[PDB]
Design a binder for this molecule. Sequence first.
Ligand SMILES: Nc1ncnc2c1ncn2[C@@H]1O[C@H](COP(=O)(O)OP(=O)(O)NP(=O)(O)O)[C@@H](O)[C@H]1O
Ligand SMILES: [Mg+2]
Ligand SMILES: [Zn+2]
Ligand SMILES: [Zn+2]
Lengths: 541, 244, 82, 287, 208, 114
Amino acid sequence: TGRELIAEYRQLITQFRNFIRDFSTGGFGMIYRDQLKRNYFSHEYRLEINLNHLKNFDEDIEMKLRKFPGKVLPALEEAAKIVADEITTPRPKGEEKLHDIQVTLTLDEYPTSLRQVKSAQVSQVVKISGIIVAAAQVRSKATKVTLQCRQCKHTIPDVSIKPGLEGFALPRTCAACPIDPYIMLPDKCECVDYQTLKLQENPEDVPHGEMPRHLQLFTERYLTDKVVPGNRVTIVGVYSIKKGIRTPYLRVLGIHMETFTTFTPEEERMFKTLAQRKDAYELIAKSIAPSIYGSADIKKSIACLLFGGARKKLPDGITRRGDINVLLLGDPGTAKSQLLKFVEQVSPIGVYTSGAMVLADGGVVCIDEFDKIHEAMEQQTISIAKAGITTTLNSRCSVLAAANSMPTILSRFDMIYIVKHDVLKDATLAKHVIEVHVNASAAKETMFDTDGFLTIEFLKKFVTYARLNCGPRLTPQASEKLVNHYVKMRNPPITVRQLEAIVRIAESIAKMELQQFATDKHVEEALRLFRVSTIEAAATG
Amino acid sequence: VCNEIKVRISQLPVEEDIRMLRQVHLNMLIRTAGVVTIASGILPQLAVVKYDCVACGYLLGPFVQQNDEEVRPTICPSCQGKGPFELNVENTVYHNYQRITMQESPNKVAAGRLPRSKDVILLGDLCDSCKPGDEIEVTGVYTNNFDGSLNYKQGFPVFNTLIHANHITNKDKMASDQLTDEDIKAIRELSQDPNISQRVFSSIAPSIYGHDDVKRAIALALFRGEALRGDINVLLCGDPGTAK
Amino acid sequence: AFARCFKPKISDKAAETLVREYKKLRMSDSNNAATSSWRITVRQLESLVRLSEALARLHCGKEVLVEHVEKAAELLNKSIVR
Amino acid sequence: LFSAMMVSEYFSIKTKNWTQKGDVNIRHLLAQLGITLHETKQKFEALPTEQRNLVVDVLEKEMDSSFATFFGTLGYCGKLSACDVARAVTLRLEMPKSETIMNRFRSGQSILRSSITGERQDRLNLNNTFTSICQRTLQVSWKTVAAAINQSEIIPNGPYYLFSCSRSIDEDMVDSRHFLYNTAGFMIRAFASMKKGRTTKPLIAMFPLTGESAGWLVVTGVMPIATIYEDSLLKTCIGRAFERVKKMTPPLRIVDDYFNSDIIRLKSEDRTRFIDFLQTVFEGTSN
Amino acid sequence: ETVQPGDKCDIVGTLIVIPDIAQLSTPGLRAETSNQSEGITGLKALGVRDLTYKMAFLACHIQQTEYLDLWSKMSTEDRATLKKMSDDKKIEKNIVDSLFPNIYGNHEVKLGVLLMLLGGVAKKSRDEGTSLRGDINVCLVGDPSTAKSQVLKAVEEFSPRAIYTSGKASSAAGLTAAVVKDEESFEFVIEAGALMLADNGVCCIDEF
Amino acid sequence: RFDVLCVIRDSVDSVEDERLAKFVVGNHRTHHPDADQMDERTGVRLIPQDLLRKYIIYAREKCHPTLPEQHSEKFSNIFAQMRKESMATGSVAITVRHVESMIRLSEAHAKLHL
DNA sequence: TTTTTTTTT
Ligand SMILES: Nc1ncnc2c1ncn2[C@@H]1O[C@H](COP(=O)(O)OP(=O)(O)NP(=O)(O)O)[C@@H](O)[C@H]1O
Ligand SMILES: [Mg+2]
Ligand SMILES: [Zn+2]
Ligand SMILES: [Zn+2]
């Protein structure tokens, strides 16, 4: 009865060829024909088809494709191959080989709940939604294999293997020789990529007081390496049972996703306009955390932390650091954690936390509750030698620390503040802050913001621009002041660490203006900031 | 919608302990009760099977899948020979399957004894109907089968035993949170009165005397803020024996 | 072995006596709050009821009488005093 | 089909789904008609053609109406209905009032041109218009009627019934003639179905505004249910009643700029005097 | 199921020998060792394998070694003696002097331990599932050579279901209940430890 | 993380000891296996327990209180007074979290009256 | 599984 199946198969190929050629949106717009031609010349051997367009063209083959996908879908792939040959011939010399094309599907329906796939839906096309929770490494699967007999060396070529997580059984005895005599040649088989994923149902759809359920997914060729854990997806695929009890899995036919370092001349002109302004440094310091009152010198210090100094390597190989580090002390209140969260949002790379020290090469780490590493701060490296291990972890970053209160580690911080009788001024602040929170309750009921402060999306891009492009130095006249200041303070706790910290702060201030050189102006502002911050620790405690 | 209406049967008069089942009750209908401890996931199982004949394309079957067998044919009658066989994907039928373990209730165990346990099998629309920890009551058929590995374990020709579930009542199902028109009318009539705040505050925990601050905190915390946490959180600290 | 089949109930005068003896215990502990070796809470009344029921079982009584509460309070005081 | 049924006037009045028994009533009704819950709750495009024809025949025979309309087809694209395109054009013309009048006119023009082409982007715009605001308008109107019945907002006030809100659910929709006429016509028949003897009076409805029109009300009304029309013309007099209320002395703060006479704007302070004046007009026509 | 753990019993029956049945292969069963100190060799079913044996007792009869209707049933001697004991007005002294004959003084400790043997009435809340505990707990603290171990040993000798332990020679598994797995079977099982063997009885812990 | 903190201190007293002892002895005396209401302090009627549960279930899901702007004048002045007195005392400060807690409690109290 | 010992943090 094989000729009847051959007649059915060739009829299906004829109808799918007619669908790919004749479907149109009016005029000369044959969308699938044009898409197939563009994909083939782009060297992407794939096509994507909408089943509602197919249902409007012919209802019967669409219904058959849904109910018998393992029988009907290879005919559609074969029809796509034939139409691609017709479209592209005569191909140029060297490109005579005809490639093999993968067909994918889309479908406009409500997805089925992952808990409510009926047992009648085995071996049928279904649509499911969820979250990707895990993703394995890509592996190879054999499509066609060559067999040879162990004793008499007779061969069976081009034995084809069915798709999915299915095995296949070898011939038990020789066709032309003991039990199970055939072997598989490693050199004369064809292979394609595949990948396994795991899908979790959406937490919105879990019934109250229960854990979510899971399903395993199988993907092939162009559908591999398309997703990462955490992604939200909708999937069209065949519901299958893995080879009287079996576990189920889904063979994927279509995925739908439910979700810097480059600039325009407009962006460069915007950055340069802000750099050309005289009040740019004060404007950036004002733009840091506008919801939190006051703290002007602290906001200036955080701007210096974000921009940093230059980084140097002399001919003998000893490097000089560019990072800057800041510490905050005093009462546990006054929105310290909100300042740290703002720096975490604004910084090009960064982390907030209460190891963690490693994870920010070129970035910023905010540490709360610091009263809970000396090598990490100075050497930008930590080391270990315990039983059976010795390694070193190296990473470059700047650190902002908040404490609630060792005298040893105070040497490692460039700037220190003590936050500390507010009640009369705090009455006006209470009026403003409670008016803000009642306005937030009422709410519950692109360089500039509306209030003149800089936007976060512009500020983050501008910091990322400046760090990769400015790189300043000091003028000799700027260098001449620091020598006299150092000698006077030391011969009226003065150290070379403090001198290099002042030099780094002066370079950081000159970076924001996009200067070639730092001058006496930047040195004097750096000295003012250093005195105002550090002498609080000399006066207190 | 359907193919077949199942008949479930309830209020069977005689109850047995898990501890008291004997060889008399094999292939009889019984009713027991206990606590769920373990439940498997939902899996599809073969129900009705058909096979292809590789030699001539004839479809063999249907064979109703038995409980503990790999049913197969041996001869295709349309070619009168032992042709090779393949599973027919297009005509095979499945149903849902689940397996749970049930233990005797700790309240009903006598002095110094250990509770016993049984495995229960759920099919179809009985699946997913209970959780671990639930007090449940089962009605079904008590049956037996041979297992050679169980024989080798015990050293005597012992037989495995099971219950095939036919009806379940879950005693721990909470009440439905749905209100009648009578209930909504009573709620409106209560809300119209002017003393309703003091009614609610004082009527929480009427046996405890005083501590109106704790009563008002609990009363306002049972209702919720609108939301940005909306929940109102309360902490109590007190000496031992102060009825906290 | 025979006496543990009895399940005595609480009589009215026994309930009154239990209230009075619990008051006596807590009063004396409050009078010696800084110097008593062990505090007194609600749990001592549970212990007092248990001891009264045990004494009723010893005498094979079908109800707790005044004397069971009195001797249980005496034994509890003699254990407590330190 | 389930969501389409649960916001219509006919099935809501038949099942009384603003009450607690509505879900039970519609489940029993579907069981009587012979339609499965899964058929009603999947998307209507997903059904096979013969199944669609059977279900449409059953529900047409149930509703028992003589309605007929025009269908337009173009190539292998989906068939459209003139009634659905009319709803989409109306809701792009009349809402939101914060947009300028020429922009709303151009939006309605674009939606009307989208229905006579097979282009993918144009049909996508049309389907987005169907699946957001056309659904949302029906749901808001049903919520208004349900809240009115369940909290007893409708009171007798002499020769007419009066309805007033604490808050309007969506103030962009309140100024639309389509919304106002449909909601008030639904509300009077829903109110009259609950109890006998309610058919012989008109209904007057008031909605408040906030923001840039804080302190104003939008006022409209509907004829009694028991009225008999001598022919098919559907004559009304409530706009004339509002117009004759405007002529009384001392004057009231009424705005009467619309082309439709049975919609007006009223200052919030003049509500009591407006109620008394309108009662005087209806009583003077009763005399 | 006529007997429980912790019981002490007399058994009447016969001694039998059981083989290692996993070594044999017959129609209907292949050998488990093939699927997954020298014995007997030669049988058709033992192709290359060998057979060994274990002892077991095949019990013919088992028993343990030792309310108004029950009171009526213990009719002549028991009701006469126990009613005379119930009439005895100095039964407290007469019982403690017979339970602890070798110990001088300590009348409070003797009476407290006697009341611990009897205990209170356990009660259940009728719908909450909560309960009011009827069991009494006693602790002894004191100087060396004050007869603490003597009292504990006397209680464990007297009582029917009592067990004695030392805190230095005990583990959390063995004290109350424990998890074990079988090797005749291979599933996990529960061992009733000393507290559960002393369920509705007394557990004595020395050197707590 | 807690909007409300409460202290339940022990105190020796004949009357409270009597009430507690009578209640506990009644629990034993009634739980032996064979063996319109108003509050004392106010005379105010109790609510049946399941009806109170239904009241809470209805109020949670069918009522959503609005907050007009004018009450800010009361909340802000009382916060400024409380914070000034605490900081002048030299004690644990009253901060913006307490403003959040006051707003939540007022919304819940509106939901009580529906 | 639970039990007992010797090096490491
Ligand atoms: N009141 C007593 N009457 C009789 N013999 C007593 C008495 N008090 C102590 N003894 C004797 O003291 C010795 C020790 O008894 P023992 O049971 O070990 O007491 P203990 O307190 O448990 N000792 P220890 O375990 O080291 O604290 C025994 O020989 C008892 O006979
Ligand atoms: Mg001793
Ligand atoms: Zn060969
Ligand atoms: Zn055959």
